[PDB]
C-alpha cells in the first residue's frame, strides 16, 4: 500500500516494484524460487570460493603479467587505452573479465610467440578458464539442479504418503484389501479427522 | 551475448565518478539475470526429464512385475504348481474378459447360464464388483485343517 | 463374496480384432485411484466392441479393406517423398531455369554417379532393406532427363495423390465414418491430416515453400522426439512464469539504467546509404 | 584411550583451560585472517598510502 501510494505521489515508477512483489507470490514461481533459495548457504559459500579464487589469480597477474592489463576504452569529450596498477583496479578488471567467454583471454595483450613469457601466459589463461569458468560455475549450477531434485523428491514422498496411507489411523492401505471394510470408507466414516475436531 | 549489459555500453574506465556504480550494475545484472534465471529455466527442464523418466520406469515395472485384473505382485506365485507365467495366460487373461463382455452383449438376453445373468445384472445397472480384486483361487490351500 | 470359475465359447465376432489396438489397450490403460485398472478398461471395452462391429462390417469391402490394410506403407511413402522433395527445394531455389550447367551439373553428375554406386552397394549387401532407394535413384535420374520444375510438379502431384488415398485409408480404418460428419470434424488427428493436405495442396499451388511446414508437422510425430518435446512442454507453466520473472527483472534493470546511466547507452551501427 | 588421556589431563587445569576454548581460537584466527586479507587487498600500492 505504501509503494502504491508513493507511486501515485512521487515520480511514479514504483509499479515495477509492486509488480515484482505481487507476481513473485504465485505457487509454481515461488516453488522454483524456493529451489534456488532453500540451499542458499552452499551457493553463497561457493560464490565466496569464486571470489577468493579470482583474488588469487589477480595476485598472480599483478605479480608477473603486470603490463599486459591494458584495456580498450572510448572517452567522452568535455589514445583509447589505459593501464592500471592498484590491485583493486586489477581485481575489478578481473571481475569484469570473469564473464565473457574465455575469461582472462580476449582482454589482455595476446603476446603471440615472440616474448619469452608466452608459455606462462598460455598456461595462465587456460588454467584460469578451466578451474574458474568451468568448475566453479558448473558447481553453482549443479547445486541448483540438485536442489530441484531434492525438492521434487520431498514433494513426491509427501504426496504418496498423503494418498496411500491413512491419516490418524496410520495404516498403509494394503491391510484394507478385503473383509468388508475398505479404505475409502475407513477414511470417511471411521477415522475422519473432522469428527476428531 | 555473454556478459549482458557489459560489452555494449560505454566502458567508463576509472575516470568518471560513476565507475564503481557502473561496475556494480554490470556484475549484479550478470549474476542475477544471466546466471540464476537461465539456470532456473534449464533446471526446470532437466527436472521434467527426471520426473518423466521416473513415471515411465514406475509404469513399466508395475506393468511387468504385477498381474493385470488380478492385482497380485508376482512373489505370491513362487511355488505350488501355479506360476505367474501361466496365471497371466490361462487364469486372468483380460482377452477372455473381453470375450465375456462381448458374449454378454451379443447374446439374446435369455437362455444363458447362471453366472452370465449375474454378470449382466452387474453390467447393465451398477458397479463392477464382480472382478477378482485381489484373489485368485490358486494361493488358497485346502480346508482340511479346520475341518 | 465367493469366487467361481466359468468356461464359455468365445464369440465369433471377437476374431475381427487387430493387433495394433490390442497392444494399444494393453499399454495405454492406467490405474485410476485405488491401484486398479478396471474402470478405464470397461470404457475402452465398450469402445473395442464398437470397433469390432465396424471391422466386421468393413470386412465385406475388400478393395477398401485392401486400401485400409497398408496405411503404414502410405505414411512411409508420404514421409520419404516429403523429405526428398524438401531436400530438392532447399538446395535449388534461385530457380529461374537452374538447368544451365555452369559447373554445377558436372559436380552434380559426379554426385549422382557416387549415389548410384552407393545405392548399388546397398542393394547388393542389404537386399531386403532399401526399397525406397531405387525410387530415389529413379527420381534423381528423372532430374537429368527433364527440368527441375516439371520434376517438382510431378513429385507434388504424387504427394497429393498419396495423401488423398491415405485419407480414405484412415477414414476406413476408424469407426467415425458412420457416426456422422461433426464427429470426425471434432476429431483432432483428422483435423491435423486435413491441415497437412491443405498445406501440401497450397505448396503445389502458391509460391511453393510450404514443405518445410509439412516436414515440421510430420517429423514432430515420432515417439522419442515427441517424448523430449513432452519433457519441455509438460511443465510449461513454470517455464512461462519464470520467463515473465525474467521480463520483469530486466524491466527493473532498464528502469535503473534509464534513471542513472542514461548517456552510456550508445550502440555501434552501420547505416545503409540511400 | 582418549578417556584415559582426558583423565590424565584433567589435573593440568591451565592447559585444560587453554584446550577447552579452542573453537574460540579458531574463530578469532579466521576472522582476523579475513579482515587482514581485506586490508591487504584494498591497499597495496603502499609506498606510504
Ligand atoms: C536504486 C534506488 C533508486 C534511488 C532513488 C532516487 C530517486 C530519484 O531518482 O528521483 C527521481 C524519481 O525517480 C524515482 O523515484 C525512482 C524510484 C523507483 C525506481 C526503483 C526501481 C528499482 C531500483 C531498486 C526524480 O528525479 P529525476 O527523474 O532523476 O529528474 C530528472 C529530470 N527528468 C525527469 C526530466 C528526466
Ligand atoms: C530479498 C529479501 C527482502 C524482502 C523485501 C520485502 C519483502 C516483504 C516481507 C514479507 C514477505 C512475505 O510476504 O512472505 C511471504 C513470501 O512471499 C514473498 O516473499 C513476497 C515478497 C516479495 C519479495 C520481495 C523481494 C525484493 C527484492 C510468505 O508467504 P506464505 O508464508 O507462504 O503465506 C502466504 C499465502 N500463500 C501460501 C498463498 C503464499
Ligand atoms: C534472484 C532471486 C533469489 C532471491 C529470492 C529471495 C528469497 O527467496 O527469500 C529468501 C530469504 O533469503 C533472502 O533474503 C535472499 C536475498 C538475497 C538477495 C540476492 C542477491 C544476489 C546477488 C527465503 O526466505 P522466505 O521464503 O521469506 O522464508 C522461508 C523460511 N523457511 C526457510 C523456514 C522456509
Ligand atoms: C545468489 C545467491 C542466492 C541467495 C540465497 C539466499 C540465502 O542466502 O538464504 C540463506 C539465508 O542465510 C544466509 O546464509 C545469509 C545470507 C543472507 C543474504 C546474503 C546474500 C548475499 C548475495 C549473494 C552472494 C539460507 O539460510 P541458511 O543459512 O542456509 O539457514 C537456513 C536453515 N536451514 C539450514 C536449517 C535450512
Ligand atoms: C603445465 C606446466 C608444464 C609447462 C609446459 C610448457 C613447456 C615449456 C617449454 C617451452 C615452451 C615452447 O616450446 O614454446 C613453444 C610453444 O609454446 C608452448 O609450448 C606453450 C605450452 C602450452 C602447452 C600445454 C598444454 C596443456 C597444458 C594444460 C594446463 C593445465 C590445465 C613456442 O614455439 P616457437 O617460439 O614458435 O619456436 C621455438 C621452439 N623451437 C626452438 C623448438 C623451435
Ligand atoms: C604450473 C605453472 C608454472 C609455470 C609453467 C610454465 C613453464 C614454462 C617455463 C617458462 C615460463 C616463465 O618464463 O616463467 C616466468 C613467469 O613467471 C610467472 O609468474 C609464472 C606465471 C604463472 C603460472 C600460471 C598460474 C598458476 C597459478 C594460478 C592461480 C592458482 C592459485 C592456486 C594457489 C595454490 C618467470 O620468469 P621471470 O622470473 O620473470 O624471469 C625471466 C625468465 N628469464 C630469466 C629466462 C628471462
Ligand atoms: C556492493 C555494494 C558495496 C560497494 C563497494 C564499492 C566501494 C566504493 C568506494 C569507492 C570505490 C573505489 O575505490 O574506486 C576504485 C575501484 O573501484 C571499485 O572499487 C569498484 C567496486 C567493485 C568491487 C565490488 C566487488 C564485489 C561486488 C559484488 C556485487 C554483487 C553481485 C578506483 O580506484 P582509482 O580511481 O584508480 O584510484 C582512487 C582510489 N585511491 C584514492 C584510494 C587511490
Ligand atoms: C511468416 C508468415 C509468412 C508471410 C506470408 C507472405 C507470403 C509471401 O511472402 O508471398 C511469397 C510466397 O512466399 C510464401 O508464401 C511463404 C509462406 C510459407 C513459408 C513459411 C515458413 C514458416 C513461417 C511461419 C511470394 O512473394 P515474394 O516471394 O516475396 O516475391 C518476390 C519476388 N521473387 C520471388 C523474385 C523473389
Ligand atoms: C504450437 C501449437 C499449435 C499447433 C499448430 C497445428 C497443430 C495441429 C493440431 C493437431 C495436433 C495433433 O496432431 O495432435 C497429436 C500431437 O502431435 C502433434 O502435435 C503434431 C502437430 C505438429 C505440431 C505443430 C507445431 C506448429 C508450430 C496427438 O497425437 P496422439 O494423441 O498421441 O495420437 C496420435 C498417434 N500416435 C500415438 C502415433 C502419436
Ligand atoms: C519449442 C518447442 C516447444 C513447443 C511444442 C508445442 C507442444 O508441445 O504442444 C503443447 C501445447 O502447448 C502449446 O501450444 C505451446 C505453443 C507455444 C509456442 C512456443 C513459443 C516459444 C517462444 C502440448 O499440447 P498437446 O501435446 O497437443 O496435448 C497434450 C494434452 N495433455 C496435456 C492432456 C497431455
Ligand atoms: C518457451 C515456453 C515453452 C512453451 C510451454 C507450453 C505451454 O505453455 O503449455 C502450457 C499451456 O497452458 C498455458 O500455460 C498457457 C500458455 C499457452 C501458450 C503461451 C506461450 C507463450 C510463449 C512463451 C512465453 C501447459 O498447460 P498448463 O497451464 O500447465 O495446465 C496443464 C494442466 N496440468 C497442470 C494439470 C498439467
Ligand atoms: C548496492 C548498489 C548501491 C550503490 C553501490 C555503489 C557504492 C559506491 C558509492 C558511489 C556510487 C554513485 O556514485 O552512485 C550515483 C549513481 O546514481 C544512480 O542512479 C545509482 C547507481 C545504481 C547502483 C546499481 C543498482 C542496483 C540495482 C539493480 C536492479 C535491482 C532490482 C531489484 C529491485 C529490488 C549516485 O550519485 P548521483 O546522485 O548521480 O550524484 C553524483 C555524486 N556526487 C554528488 C558525489 C558527484
Ligand atoms: Zn484410519
Ligand atoms: Zn491375476
Swiss-Prot record, chain A:
Polyubiquitinated. Polyubiquitination targets ITPR1 for proteasomal degradation. Approximately 40% of the ITPR1-associated ubiquitin is monoubiquitin, and polyubiquitins are both 'Lys-48'- and 'Lys-63'-linked. The chain crosses the membrane at residues 1-20, 43-63, 125-145. It is found in: Endoplasmic reticulum membrane; Cytoplasmic vesicle, Secretory vesicle membrane; Cytoplasm, Perinuclear region. Residues 21-42 are cytoplasmic. Disulfide bonds join 83-89. Zn(2+) binds at residues 166, 169, 186, 191. ATP binds at residues 166-167, 191, 193. Belongs to the InsP3 receptor family. Homotetramer. Homodimer. Interacts with ERP44 in a pH-, redox state- and calcium-dependent manner which results in the inhibition the calcium channel activity. The strength of this interaction inversely correlates with calcium concentration. Part of cGMP kinase signaling complex at least composed of ACTA2/alpha-actin, CNN1/calponin H1, PLN/phospholamban, PRKG1 and ITPR1. Interacts with IRAG1. Interacts with CABP1 (via N-terminus). Interacts with TESPA1. Inositol 1,4,5-trisphosphate-gated calcium channel that, upon inositol 1,4,5-trisphosphate binding, mediates calcium release from the endoplasmic reticulum (ER). Undergoes conformational changes upon ligand binding, suggesting structural flexibility that allows the channel to switch from a closed state, capable of interacting with its ligands such as 1,4,5-trisphosphate and calcium, to an open state, capable of transferring calcium ions across the ER membrane. Cytoplasmic calcium released from the ER triggers apoptosis by the activation of CAMK2 complex. The ITPR1 structure has a large solenoid CY assembly built around the central helical bundle made of the C-terminal domains from four ITPR1 subunits. The solenoid scaffold includes domains responsible for binding of ligands and regulatory proteins and is connected via an allosteric nexus at the cytosolic-membrane interface to the transmembrane channel assembly. Six transmembrane helices from each subunit form the central ion-conduction pore. This is Inositol 1,4,5-trisphosphate-gated calcium channel ITPR1. It comes from Rattus norvegicus (Rat). The gene is Itpr1. The chain holds residues 2399 to 2642 of 2750 of the full protein.
Amino acid at each position: 500500500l505504501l509503494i502504491c501510494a508513493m507511486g501515485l505521489f512521487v515520480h511514479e515508477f514504483f509499479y515495477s516494484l509492486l509488480l515484482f512483489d505481487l507476481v513473485y507470490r504465485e505457487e509454481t514461481l515461488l516453488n522454483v524460487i524456493k529451489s534456488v533459495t532453500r540451499n542458499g548457504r552452499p551457493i553463497i559459500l561457493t560464490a565466496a570460493l569464486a571470489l577468493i579464487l579470482v583474488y588469487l589469480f589477480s595476485i598472480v597477474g599483478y605479480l608477473f603479467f603486470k603490463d599486459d592489463f591494458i584495456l580498450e576504452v572510448d572517452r567522452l569529450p568535455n589514445k583509447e587505452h589505459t593501464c592500471e596498477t592498484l590491485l583493486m583496479c586489477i581485481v575489478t578488471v578481473l571481475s569484469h573479465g570473469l564473464r565473457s567467454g574465455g575469461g582472462v583471454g580476449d582482454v589482455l595483450r595476446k603476446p603471440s610467440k615472440e616474448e619469452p613469457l608466452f608459455a606462462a601466459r598460455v598456461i595462465y589463461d587456460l588454467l584460469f578458464f578451466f578451474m574458474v569458468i568451468i568448475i566453479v560455475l558448473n558447481l553453482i549450477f549443479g547445486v541448483i539442479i540438485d536442489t530441484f531434485a531434492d525438492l521434487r523428491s520431498e514433494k513426491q514422498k509427501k504426496e504418496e504418503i498423503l494418498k496411500t496411507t491413512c491419516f490418524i489411523c496410520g495404516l498403509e492401505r494394503d491391510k484394507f484389501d478385503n473383509k468388508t471394510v475398505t479404505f475409502e470408507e475407513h477414511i470417511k466414516e471411521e477415522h475422519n479427522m473432522w469428527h476428531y475436531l | 551475448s555473454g556478459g549482458g549489459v557489459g560489452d555494449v555500453l560505454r566502458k567508463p574506465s576509472k575516470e568518471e565518478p560513476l565507475f564503481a556504480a557502473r561496475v556494480i550494475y554490470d556484475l549484479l545484472f550478470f549474476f542475477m539475470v544471466i546466471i540464476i534465471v537461465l539456470n532456473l529455466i534449464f533446471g526446470v527442464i532437466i527436472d521434467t526429464f527426471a520426473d518423466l523418466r521416473s513415471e515411465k520406469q514406475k509404469k513399466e515395472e508395475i506393468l511387468k512385475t504385477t498381474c493385470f485384473i488380478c492385482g497380485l505382485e508376482r512373489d505370491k506365485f513362487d511355488n505350488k504348481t501355479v506360476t505367474f507365467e501361466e496365471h497371466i495366460k490361462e487364469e486372468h487373461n483380460m482377452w477372455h474378459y473381453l470375450c465375456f463382455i462381448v458374449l454378454v452383449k451379443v447374446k439374446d438376453s435369455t437362455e444363458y447360464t447362471g453366472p452370465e445373468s449375474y454378470v449382466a445384472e452387474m453390467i447393465r445397472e451398477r458397479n463392477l464388483d464382480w472382478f477378482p480384486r485381489m484373489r485368485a483361487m490358486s494361493l488358497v490351500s485346502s480346508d482340511s485343517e479346520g475341518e | 463374496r465367493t469366487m467361481e470359475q466359468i468356461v464359455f465359447p468365445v464369440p465369433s465376432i471377437c476374431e475381427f480384432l487387430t493387433k495394433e489396438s490390442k497392444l494399444r489397450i494393453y499399454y495405454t490403460t492406467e490405474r485410476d485411484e485405488q491401484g486398479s485398472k478396471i474402470n478405464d478398461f470397461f470404457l475402452r471395452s465398450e469402445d473395442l466392441f464398437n470397433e469390432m462391429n465396424w471391422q466386421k462390417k468393413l470386412r465385406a469391402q475388400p478393395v477398401l479393406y485392401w486400401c485400409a490394410r497398408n496405411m503404414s506403407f502410405w505414411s512411409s511413402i508420404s514421409f520419404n517423398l516429403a523429405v526428398l522433395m524438401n531436400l530438392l527445394v532447399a538446395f535449388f531455389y534461385p530457380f529461374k531455369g537452374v538447368r544451365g550447367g555452369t559447373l554445377e551439373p558436372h559436380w552434380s553428375g559426379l554426385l549422382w554417379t557416387a549415389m548410384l554406386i552407393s545405392l548399388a552397394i546397398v542393394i547388393a549387401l542389404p537386399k531386403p532393406h532399401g526399397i525406397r532407394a531405387l525410387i530415389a535413384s529413379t527420381i534423381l535420374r528423372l532430374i537429368f532427363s527433364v527440368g527441375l520444375q516439371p520434376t517438382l510438379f510431378l513429385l507434388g502431384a504424387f504427394n497429393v495423390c498419396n495423401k488423398i488415398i491415405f485419407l480414405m485409408s484412415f477414414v476406413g480404418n476408424c469407426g467415425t465414418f458412420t457416426r456422422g460428419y461433426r464427429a470426425m470434424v471434432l476429431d483432432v488427428e483428422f483435423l491435423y491430416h486435413l491441415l497437412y493436405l491443405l498445406i501440401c495442396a497450397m505448396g503445389l499451388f502458391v509460391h511453393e515453400f510450404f514443405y518445410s511446414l509439412l516436414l515440421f508437422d510430420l517429423v514432430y510425430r515420432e515417439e522419442t522426439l515427441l517424448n523430449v518435446i513432452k519433457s519441455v512442454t509438460r511443465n510449461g507453466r513454470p517455464i512461462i512464469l519464470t520467463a515473465a520473472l525474467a521480463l520483469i527483472l530486466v524491466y527493473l534493470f532498464s528502469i535503473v539504467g534509464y534513471l542513472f546511466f542514461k548517456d552510456d547507452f550508445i550502440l555501434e551501427v552501420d547505416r545503409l546509404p540511400n
